[PDB]
Amino acid sequence: QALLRILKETEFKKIKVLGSGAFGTVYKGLWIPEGEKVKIPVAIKELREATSPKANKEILDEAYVMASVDNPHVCRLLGICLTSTVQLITQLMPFGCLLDYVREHKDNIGSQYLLNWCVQIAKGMNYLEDRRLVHRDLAARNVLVKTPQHVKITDFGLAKLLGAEEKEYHAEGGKVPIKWMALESILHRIYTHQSDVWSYGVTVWELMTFGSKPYDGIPASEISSILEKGERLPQPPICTIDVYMIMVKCWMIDADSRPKFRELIIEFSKMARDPQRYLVIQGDERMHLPSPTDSNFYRALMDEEDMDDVVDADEYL
Numbered sequence: 001q002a003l004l005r006i007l008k009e010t011e012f013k014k015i016k017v018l019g020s021g022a023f024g025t026v027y028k029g030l031w032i033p034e035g036e037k038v039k040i041p042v043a044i045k046e047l048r049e050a051t052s053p054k055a056n057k058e059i060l061d062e063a064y065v066m067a068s069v070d071n072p073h074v075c076r077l078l079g080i081c082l083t084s085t086v087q088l089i090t091q092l093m094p095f096g097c098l099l100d101y102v103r104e105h106k107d108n109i110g111s112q113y114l115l116n117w118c119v120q121i122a123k124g125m126n127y128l129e130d131r132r133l134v135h136r137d138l139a140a141r142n143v144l145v146k147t148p149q150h151v152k153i154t155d156f157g158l159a160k161l162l163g164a165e166e167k168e169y170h171a172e173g174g175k176v177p178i179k180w181m182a183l184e185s186i187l188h189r190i191y192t193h194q195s196d197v198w199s200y201g202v203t204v205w206e207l208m209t210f211g212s213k214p215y216d217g218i219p220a221s222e223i224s225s226i227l228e229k230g231e232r233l234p235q236p237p238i239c240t241i242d243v244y245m246i247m248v249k250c251w252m253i254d255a256d257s258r259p260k261f262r263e264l265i266i267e268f269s270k271m272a273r274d275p276q277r278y279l280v281i282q283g284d285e286r287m288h289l290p291s292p293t294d295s296n297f298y299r300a301l302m303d304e305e306d307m308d309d310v311v312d313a314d315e316y317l
């Protein structure tokens, strides 16, 4: 009945690889709670190791905060398994990430959906700020689709868990998502809720460009000098200046001057009330989102025979 379940290796199975990232590698899997008689679809993240790793109790302590979160727009940790590696277990979101979703469905996404996503992301980030948990890796890749009209943030607090605020991580070959990072994070490893704001601006940009790569082609080693010269991501073609100004504010050098998440919830909520005033999308009025389960991503994950007879984590808990 633990908030953070300590799962035995025998309790869960990695079924297929999803992909790798800076902080680790994710798998589709099944969780079979020990005494019970159900199979629950889970994502399983196995982390990158360190030469001088943290003690288990310290890892458990940070993971507890990740399991403690209770908000509609934030994913929560269901379990953890410590061995020679750290493995994190969470409810599988089979519609996939919002980044893949905008890239796939560009021609059917209207202004209402895009603005509603921005609100939802800002609400989840405001909830993390209430929990005093800096995300440190907000990006469109770390926003997951529950339904086309409901998205959730994941992967918060991992950069802290892995020691990316200290020099040792970086000296030992560790990498961080530079093209999403506030300038003060790049230069001095400062991470606050206001550095998350910057990464929020980048996320919104990714959304409004239907999943373009920020500073595409520009080497990561050149990013700090580019930012220092005042250069920023360009206005997305669909955005009025009112919307781009918000993104621009999120990337001010003075972190204290950037909008707050509580402010962004209000501003994007006002825009979502009159979406066609703020985003200019051809055919906006006549745009229909495909049935969520008819998406390629969902079928690709769930139709496998290994996924025999399963119960959604929401229905089980």
Ligand SMILES: CS(=O)(=O)CCNC(=O)C1=Cc2c(ncnc2Nc2ccc(Oc3cccc(C(F)(F)F)c3)c(Cl)c2)NCC1
Residues within 6 Å of the ligand: 018, 019, 020, 021, 026, 043, 044, 045, 066, 067, 074, 075, 076, 077, 078, 088, 089, 090, 091, 092, 093, 094, 095, 096, 097, 141, 144, 153, 154, 155, 156, 157, 158
């Ligand atoms: C570009 S790619 O190909 O590399 C993308 C690779 N990933 C994918 O395709 C997908 C992954 C995917 C998913 N459902 C559910 N979680 C997922 N990932 C994921 C992400 C992070 C995780 O660790 C946490 C770390 C800290 C907090 C939390 C917590 F939970 F508290 F928020 C979780 C864990 Cl365990 C899983 N569904 C499919 C989409």
